[PDB]
Amino acid sequence: NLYFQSMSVGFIGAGQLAFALAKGFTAAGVLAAHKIMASSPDMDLATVSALRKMGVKLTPHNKETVQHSDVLFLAVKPHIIPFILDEIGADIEDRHIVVSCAAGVTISSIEKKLSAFRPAPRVIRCMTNTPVVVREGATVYATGTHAQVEDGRLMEQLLSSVGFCTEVEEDLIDAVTGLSGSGPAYAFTALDALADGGVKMGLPRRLAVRLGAQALLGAAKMLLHSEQHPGQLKDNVSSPGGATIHALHVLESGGFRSLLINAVEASCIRTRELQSMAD
Amino acid sequence: QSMSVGFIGAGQLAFALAKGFTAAGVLAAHKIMASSPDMDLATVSALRKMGVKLTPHNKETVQHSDVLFLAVKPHIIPFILDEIGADIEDRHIVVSCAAGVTISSIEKKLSAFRPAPRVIRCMTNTPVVVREGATVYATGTHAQVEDGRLMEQLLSSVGFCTEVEEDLIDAVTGLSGSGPAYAFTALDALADGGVKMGLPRRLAVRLGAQALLGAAKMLLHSEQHPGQLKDNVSSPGGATIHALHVLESGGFRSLLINAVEASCIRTRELQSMAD
Amino acid sequence: QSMSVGFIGAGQLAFALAKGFTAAGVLAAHKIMASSPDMDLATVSALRKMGVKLTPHNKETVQHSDVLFLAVKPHIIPFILDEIGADIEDRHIVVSCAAGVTISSIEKKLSAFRPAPRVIRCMTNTPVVVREGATVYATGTHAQVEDGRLMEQLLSSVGFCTEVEEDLIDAVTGLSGSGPAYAFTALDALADGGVKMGLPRRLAVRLGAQALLGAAKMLLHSEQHPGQLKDNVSSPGGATIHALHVLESGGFRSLLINAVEASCIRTRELQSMAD
Amino acid sequence: ENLYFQSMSVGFIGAGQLAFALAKGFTAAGVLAAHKIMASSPDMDLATVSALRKMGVKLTPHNKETVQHSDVLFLAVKPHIIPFILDEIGADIEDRHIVVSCAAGVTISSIEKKLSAFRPAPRVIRCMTNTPVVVREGATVYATGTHAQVEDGRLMEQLLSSVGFCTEVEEDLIDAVTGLSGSGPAYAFTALDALADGGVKMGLPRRLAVRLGAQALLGAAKMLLHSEQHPGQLKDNVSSPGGATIHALHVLESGGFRSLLINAVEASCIRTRELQSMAD
Amino acid sequence: NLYFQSMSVGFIGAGQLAFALAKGFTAAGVLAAHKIMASSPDMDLATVSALRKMGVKLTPHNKETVQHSDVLFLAVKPHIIPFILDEIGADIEDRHIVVSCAAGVTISSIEKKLSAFRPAPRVIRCMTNTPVVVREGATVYATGTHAQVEDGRLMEQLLSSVGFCTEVEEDLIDAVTGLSGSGPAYAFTALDALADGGVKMGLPRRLAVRLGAQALLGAAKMLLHSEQHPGQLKDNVSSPGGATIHALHVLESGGFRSLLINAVEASCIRTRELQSMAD
Ligand SMILES: O=C(O)c1cccc(C(=O)N2CCOC3(CCCC3)C2)c1
Ligand SMILES: O=C(O)c1cccc(C(=O)N2CCOC3(CCCC3)C2)c1
Ligand SMILES: O=C(O)c1cccc(C(=O)N2CCOC3(CCCC3)C2)c1
Ligand SMILES: O=C(O)c1cccc(C(=O)N2CCOC3(CCCC3)C2)c1
Ligand SMILES: O=C(O)c1cccc(C(=O)N2CCOC3(CCCC3)C2)c1
C-alpha cells in the first residue's frame, strides 16, 4: 500500500533503464505514469514510444525534466553524465535528489560538477538492472555527502518496489556492477545456449527456451528462499550415477565456474578503468 | 553533376571505387583522374581500360579534381599532404580513406597552406567494386553541410553509407574495413570443408559464397535478431544444430570478436605512432 | 506457365520459397497451395496474407498441384508419402526438400501405389526468401528431362541452382544447407565485436552484414581465389593482417571445416536411422 | 663471367657458417677463385675454418689483413660483435671499399656512424641472405647506404644473384625479411625432420622418408615460383574431393598450422628488432 | 640424351596430373607432345586446353587412347579406376604397360579386373605428384605380377626424367602418398602462411611469397645435397640467443612437428580406408 503522493520523478535519458524503471514503478502502483517525465536527445526511440504509451510525459529538453522533478534519475551511459551535469547543473535546486545510475561514475565526481553551481547537492549513486521492468531488479545504492537520512530511506523505499534493494558503501558498487549489473546479460547468454542444447537433443526451440528460463528462475528462487549453500542444493539434486552429475562433470571439465568468475572480474575492472580515464 | 573526381593512389581502393562509381552511372570514367608512383601496376592498367585518366603527378590530379580521394595507405597520407597541400583550393573536398588518420592531422597539415580545408574522413571497403560496399564518413571542421550530403550521395551509389562521429571510425575499420578479409578466409575454409566431404572445389566455393551472400541479405532485409534467424533454421536434433555446436566448442564467436578488436586496436596503434 | 505448385508443409521453407517465387514473378500466389498440421503457425498466417491458398488436408494440396514440394522435416517424409501416395498421379512431380532422404526411399514408398513416380531431390536454403538461395537438385529414375529443366528454371528464379549427382547432396547440406546458420552466428559475433569496440549495436549489425554480403558478392563476381582477394585487402603491417592472425591462432578455418563435416555426417546418420 | 675477369678480392670478417656458405656458393658459381677470398676468425679451431682452408680460402687471425686484402668486405659476424669490429678496423676502410654488412638487425646508420669518424663517405650496403647460398639457391635482399654508388648496388646484385635470388629493398623491410627468409631454412629443416618422422611412423624407412619429404618441398616451392598462381589455388588443384590430401590439410588446420608459421616469422623479426635496440 | 623413340604414351584422364606429366615429359625432351594422347570425359577443362596448346593429341574416347598407346597412364581419381578398367579392359593387348597413378588402388585389384579379359596384364602402380610439371616430382613405383624386368626399368627411366624416382615394395605406397603425394599441399599451405607472416611484419605480399618459396626451395636442396641430418642443418643456422632460435621455440610451443606427423598419418590412413571400402 505504498504510494509517493508528493513525489515528481524525472528521467534524464529515455532508454532501456528509464523505461524499465518507469514500467516497474507504475506496475508497483507507487507512481502514476503522468507524474513521471523523461527526456531524450532522440525522440525517435523505441523506448520513447513505449514510455509514451504508458502515459509518461516526454520532452526533448533536459531542463524541463529538471524543473518538473523532485527525484532525478540520470539514466544515461557513463560518458554522457558529465555533459548532463554541465547542461543542467545551474537548474538543480535544494529540493532535488539526483540519483545517478551510470556505471563507474563516482559520487565525488558528480558532487564536484554540481557544487560549482550550488553547494550541497543531494546525490545518490545506484547500480540497478533492467529486470526492474518485471519488479525483480537487483539494486544497490550509496548516499552522497549532502544526502539526508530521509533521502536514502526514500530511495530504498522506491527501489525496493521493483526488486531487491540495499544500501552499500560506494567502494562496492563497481564490483556489484560486474555481478548484478552485467548479470542478466550472462543469464540471457546462458539461456540462449541452454535452448541450443535442448534443440540439439530434439526439443522445439520455443519449448526449450521456456523450460530453460523456468529452470533458471526456479533455481534462483530456491536459493533465495533457502538458508542453504548453493553447493548443498546442487548436492540434493544430483542422484548418484545419474544424468545431472554426468552433466555437472562436463561443465567442470570446461572450467565453467572460472568463466563466470572471469566475467564478474572483467566487468568490474572495465567499470573501474572507464572511470579512471574519465577522472 | 559536372563534378570532377580524383584519386591520389591508383591501387585496389581507387580501382574499386572508380569501377563502382562508373557502374552505378553516377560518374563517367572520363571525369575521373588517378595518380600513382608506379604506373606499371595491374590496377593502373585496369583503370586505363575503363577510361579513367591517369598521370604520375599528384599535382595534375589535384588540378583536375573537385572531390579528391586520398586512396593511399595510412603512412603515406602525410607525404601526400606535404606534396599537394600548396595546390588545395577553396573548391576542393579532400576525402581521406586511410585507416586511422584523423581529420585533425589532415586539417593541421593542409591549414599550413590554406586556412579552411574542407576535409571528410571515410572508411569504406573494396566490395564497392560490386556496389555492395560498407562506408562511414565524418565531416571535418570546415566541411560545408552540402559537402557531407554530396559525399553520402556519391558513396551510397556503391553500397551502404552513413555519417558517423569520427571516434567510431577506428572500430568500423575493425568491423567492415577488415570484414571482407574475414569473409574471404571463412569462404576458403568452407570450401575446404565442402571438398573434404566430397564436393568439387568449384561447386563448393560457389555454394559457400552464395550461402553467405544470401544469409547476409536475409539479415539486412529482416527486422529479426540474427539469433532468431539462426533459431528458425536449426531443425531440432538436425544437421545444422550439430554443426553449430562444433562451432561453439571452438569459440567461433570469440574469434570474430578477437578479430574486430585486434584490427581496431592496431588501427589506433598506427595513428599513435603517426602522431 | 499455367503451372500449379503445392507445398506439403507450411513452415519456414515453404514460406521462403513461396515468397521468393512470387517476388520473382515466376508464380502468382494464387497458383500455390500449402498444407500444415497446425494452422495457427506464424508462417501459415503469412502465406495467407501473400495470397497463397491454405488447407489442413495434404490431399487437397496434392489434387491442386502439378509440382509438389515436400517441405517438411526429414523424419516426416515417410508419413507424408504413406498418407498421399495413393493420390500421386502421372502429371505430378514430387520434389523432396528434406535433408538426407534419398530418392530411392521416396521412389520405393510411392511405387507401391503407382509405378513410375517422377521424383526430384533438392537441397535449398531459406535465403530463397530474398531470392539469393543456393539450391542443388538430383533427378530420379522416372523424372523426364523436361522435369529437371522445369525445376532448374523455377529454382534459379530465387537463387543459384544447379543439377548434381545425388551422392553430393548430403555434403551440400553441410555447406549451403546449414551455411546461413553459420553466417548468422558469425554476424552476431561480429556485431558483438563492433559493440565491444564502441559501435552502437544497430550500426554494428548493419556494417557486419553488409561486409559479408559485399565480400561474398566480390568472390562470386571474381575469377580469383579467395586467398588472392584476401591478399589484395591485407595492407602490410596493417589492421587487417593483424586481425587475420588472431583468427588463424584460434583455428578459425578448422572450425568451419568441422561444421560442414558435422552437418554432413549428421545428415547421413539420420538417413541411416531412417533405413 | 665478367665478375671473374674483374678479379675481385673478397673479404669476410667472420669465418663461420655464412662465410663458408657464401664462399662455397661464390666458388661453385665460378665468380671468384677460392684463393681471392680471405677470411678472419678469432677462433681458428672452428670446423667451418677447416672447411674454408680446404677450399683454398685464405685465413688470418687479423681483421686488418682481411680489410687490406678486400675490395668487397663482408661483415659476417654475429650482430653484437659488429660495433667492436668497426672500432678495430674502421681506420683501415678505404674509399675503394664496399662494406657489406650481413648481420641481422644492424642498421646502415649505425655502421655509417662508426665508419664516418674515419673516412667521410664509407660505401655501405646492408644485406640479409641465408645459408642455401651454399647450393646457389639463396634468398638475398640488400639496401644501399648513403654513399653507396649506383654501380655498387648493381655489383652487389650481380654477385649475390650468382648464388640465389637477389633483390634491392628499402632498409626498413630487412628485419621482416630476416624473420621470413633469413630464419626460413630452419623452419624447413624442422618441417622436414617432422615429415620424415611421420613417414617413418607410417612404415617408411627413414632414408626414403627424408628424401621424399625434401623432394616434395623442393618441387612444391619450385612449382609455386614458376606458377602465376596463388598458393591456395595450387593447394586447391591437388586436393581431390574426399581424398587423403584434404583430410591431412584438415588436421593441419585443426592445430593452427598457419598461425604457427606466422608466429615464427613475427618472433624472429621482433627478436631481430630488439637485438638492435639493445645495441642502440 | 634420353629419348623414347618407339614409345607411345597415353593418359586416361586429362586433369592436373596428366598435364603435369605431359609437360614434364616434353620439357625433358624424352617425348614429343604429338606422340602423347590424352582422353577426358569433359573436354571443356582448363587442363585439356593446356594440353592442346602443347600439341598433345586429345580425344573423348578412352578406347582411342588405349589403341594409340604402349604405356598407358591411369591419371584418374581412385574411385574412377574400376570404371576405366571395365570400359577398356577388353582393349588391353600384350604390348600394353598399364601404369596406375591413383592413390590407394592396389596392383591386385587392377590385375583382377584386367585378367577377366586377358591373362597376364602388365601393371605398374606408382605414386607421383604434380611438381613433375617442373621436373622436380617425387615418384615411387611397384611392379605387378606380370610386369617384366624391362617394364620397371623403362618406367624408372621415364619417371626419373621429371624428378626423383625409385622402386618400392607396394606396401609402402600408401605411406608415400601421405608424405610426398600430399606433401606439396602441405608446402603450399605453409608458404601461404609464411607469406602472411611476412605481410604482418611489413613486407609486400609479392616479395613475401617469393622469399618464402625461395627459402623452402633452398633449404630442401641443402638437405638433399648434404649427408647431414636436418637437425644438424637447423643447428648450423640458429645463432645463440638469435632471431631464428626464438622463432623455433614458438614453433615447438605450438607442436609444429606433431602437426606434420598428424598430416602424413591422416593422409596415409585415409588412403588405406578409401581402398578398404573400394575392396
Ligand atoms: O539422473 C538424474 O540426475 C535425474 C535427473 C532428473 C530426474 C531424475 C529422477 O529420476 N528423480 C526421481 C526422484 O529423485 C530425483 C530428485 C533428486 C534426484 C532424483 C528426481 C534423475
Ligand atoms: O591497416 C589496414 O589493414 C587497413 C584496413 C582498412 C583500410 C585501410 C586503408 O587505409 N585503405 C586505403 C588504401 O587502400 C586500402 C584497400 C585495401 C588496402 C588499403 C584501404 C587499411
Ligand atoms: O537437419 C537439418 O538441420 C537440416 C538442414 C538443411 C535442411 C533441412 C530440411 O530437411 N528442410 C526441410 C524443412 O524445412 C527446413 C528449413 C529450415 C529447417 C527445415 C529445411 C534440415
Ligand atoms: O586422395 C588424394 O588426395 C590423393 C593424393 C595423391 C594422389 C591422388 C590420386 O589419385 N591422383 C590421380 C590423378 O590426380 C591427382 C593430382 C591431383 C589430385 C589427383 C593424383 C589422390
Ligand atoms: O639471429 C639469427 O638467428 C640470425 C638470422 C639471420 C641472420 C643472422 C646473422 O646475423 N648472420 C651473420 C653470420 O652468421 C649467420 C649464419 C648462421 C647464424 C648467423 C648469419 C642471424
Swiss-Prot record, chain D:
Q: What does this protein do?
A: Oxidoreductase that catalyzes the last step in proline biosynthesis, which corresponds to the reduction of pyrroline-5-carboxylate to L-proline using NAD(P)H. At physiologic concentrations, has higher specific activity in the presence of NADH. Involved in the cellular response to oxidative stress.
Keywords, A to Z?
A: Acetylation, Amino-acid biosynthesis, Disease variant, Mitochondrion, NADP, Oxidoreductase, Phosphoprotein, Proline biosynthesis, Stress response
Q: In the UniProt record, does the keyword Cytoplasm occur?
A: no
This chain belongs to which protein, by name? Pyrroline-5-carboxylate reductase 1, mitochondrial
Question: What species is this protein from?
Answer: Homo sapiens (Human)
Task: Provide the leader sequence positions.
Answer: none
Q: Which disease is it linked to?
A: Cutis laxa, autosomal recessive, 2B: A disorder characterized by an excessive congenital skin wrinkling, a large fontanelle with delayed closure, a typical facial appearance with downslanting palpebral fissures, a general connective tissue weakness, and varying degrees of growth and developmental delay and neurological abnormalities. Patients do not manifest metabolic abnormalities. Cutis laxa, autosomal recessive, 3B: A disorder characterized by an aged appearance with distinctive facial features, sparse hair, ophthalmologic abnormalities, intrauterine growth retardation, and cutis laxa.
Q: Which residues bind NADPH?
A: 15, 17-18, 41, 43, 63, 77-78, 104, 237
Activity regulation: Subject to competitive inhibition by the reaction product proline. Subject to competitive inhibition by stearoyl coenzyme A.
